[PDB]
Design a protein around this ligand. Structure first.
Ligand SMILES: [O-][O-]
Ligand SMILES: [Cu+2]
Ligand SMILES: [Cu+2]
Ligand SMILES: [Cu+2]
Ligand SMILES: [Cu+2]
Length: 501
């Protein structure tokens, strides 16, 4: 297999505005098919990249900065990854739309799966309204990320390389003196399988297919043989012996990580999806499902000279392999100090996170299609079925998510962030047989990591997860879905209409 830790970690350049004034910041980002080397020992790989880059450029904005991004499709008219036409029913083959994940945006700038467009906007989906997206950024400082969200193609377009980081900086947080600038580094983690000729591999069918099954066929999960951070296989990063802030983003299709440091040292978590936690949290390890973000500090001060592996204990389709997917990247504490470390790891970060208008019971279920494939469904509805999740703007609801399946689903709501209330185990067999919910244990409050603001949340097997969200500030057409892209595309995604009575 590919030799670990021979390439330096790329750090995406920060995007520069096409035009900027005190009143408006205007960016242009074009999707392009490009070639990039993923590892010292591979031929260059054909990829799709925002501005031809994988990951795309990091976008940095201030809270309340009035930002517009014209996302453009300049991609080939044919895909290079296997499209399954059976999963969705004259349209272009390559459809794209950019979703600012965690963004608080009007609905027509949110990247709705049916607001897609082909090259040069020649054809546009049924809910397309605009070319230039508006991001008012009137929301908490946080780590966001952007990625393709096109109907029935998300797993493919994201796997092709269409992901990037988007950081909101709230100037009110500057006084905390968290590690900043060169000492504040995003880590976009994406697992991939790569052929010997350097081409991306994505499966065209499940294992040992019926013959029979459409070809290509969607698969219900994807586990890559190799781990990349910031577009490089198993990279190293030379760090100074001092505190760093890392914006850890899981940009993988299916894979969940469980991260630790191989010297047994601690992370300090300072932030979750929705921004700074009320208090910093000392952690030895953490799980990180698709689309979750952990904003962390690692203090290398006492580790000068050392090589420390960011390790992973979570398997994907099997036990983790010590020589491969057990590794993420390697820190080498060998960079000389550019200056005194004047950063801080404060205990007190932010304030702690209303009438309950509605309690919504939701189940994670599904059925089998005519080919015998599993179709994952929220409340046994298709995407296309009339909308049922219709919160009223400005009101708070509790959503109670029942998971009687065998696996965890990272459930994501667009627009809002939410609080995690609790998780409670139930009798799966009794639920499947009668629809009756019978608890087998008391409710468990969230771990400290989940006591702030979240937008993507692990709903574990045989549990009811309860979250609470206030729906706003915008009314309109949004989405909620599982963020395992293989599940999202078939068909674990539903409209979420926030209404204005
Ligand atoms: O967010 O998909
Ligand atoms: Cu997302
Ligand atoms: Cu989202
Ligand atoms: Cu799922
Ligand atoms: Cu989404």
């Amino acid at each position: 297999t590919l030799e670990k830790f021979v390439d330096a970690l790329p750090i995406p350049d920060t995007l520069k505005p096409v035009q900027q004034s005190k009143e408006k910041t205007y960016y242009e980002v074009t999707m392009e098919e490009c070639t990039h080397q993923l590892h010292r020992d591979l031929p260059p790989t054909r990829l799709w990249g925002y501005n031809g880059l994988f990951p795309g450029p990091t976008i940095e904005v201030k809270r309340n900065e009035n930002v517009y991004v014209k996302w453009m499709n300049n991609l080939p008219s044919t895909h290079f990854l296997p499209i399954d036409h059976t999963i969705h029913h004259e349209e272009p083959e390559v459809k794209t739309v950019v979703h600012l994940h965690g963004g608080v945006t009007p609905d027509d700038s949110a990247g709705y799966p049916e607001a897609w467009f082909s090259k040069d906007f020649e054809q546009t989906g049924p809910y397309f309204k605009r070319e230039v997206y508006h991001y008012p950024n009137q929301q908490r400082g946080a780590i966001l990320w952007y990625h393709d969200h096109a109907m029935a193609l998300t797993r493919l377009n994201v796997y092709a390389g269409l992901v990037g980081a988007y950081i909101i900086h709230d100037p009110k947080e500057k006084r905390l003196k968290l590690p900043s600038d060169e000492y504040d580094v995003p880590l976009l983690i994406t697992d991939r399988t790569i052929n010997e000729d350097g081409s991306l591999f994505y499966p065209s069918a499940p294992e040992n297919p019926s013959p029979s099954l459409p070809n290509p066929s969607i698969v219900p999960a994807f586990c890559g043989e190799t781990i990349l951070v910031n577009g490089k296989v198993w990279p190293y990063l030379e760090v100074e012996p001092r505190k760093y802030r890392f914006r850890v983003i899981n940009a993988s299709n299916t894979r969940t990580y469980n991260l630790s440091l191989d010297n047994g040292g601690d992370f300090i978590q300072i932030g979750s999806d929705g921004g700074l936690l009320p208090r910093s949290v000392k952690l030895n390890s953490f799980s990180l499902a698709p689309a979750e973000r952990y904003d962390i500090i690692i203090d290398f001060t006492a580790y000068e000279g050392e090589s420390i592996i960011l390790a992973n204990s979570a398997g994907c389709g099997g036990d983790v392999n010590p020589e491969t997917d057990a590794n993420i990247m390697q820190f080498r504490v060998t960079k000389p100090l550019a200056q005194k470390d004047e950063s801080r790891k404060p205990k007190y970060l932010a304030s702690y996170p209303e009438r309950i208008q509605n309690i919504r019971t939701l189940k994670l279920a599904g059925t089998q299609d005519e080919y015998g494939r599993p179709v994952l469904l929220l409340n046994n509805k298709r995407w296309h079925d009339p909308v049922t999740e219709t919160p009223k703007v400005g009101t708070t609801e509790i959503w109670s998510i029942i998971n009687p399946t065998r696996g965890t689903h990272p459930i994501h709501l667009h627009l809002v962030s939410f609080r995690v209330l609790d998780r409670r185990p139930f009798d799966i067999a009794r639920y499947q047989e009668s629809g009756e919910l019978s608890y087998t244990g008391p409710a468990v409050p969230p771990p400290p990591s989940e006591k702030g603001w979240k937008d993507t949340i692990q709903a574990h097997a045989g549990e009811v997860l309860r979250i609470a969200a206030t729906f706003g500030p915008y009314s309109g057409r949004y989405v909620w879905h599982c963020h395992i892209l293989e599940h999202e595309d078939y068909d674990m995604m539903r409209p979420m209409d926030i209404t204005d009575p």
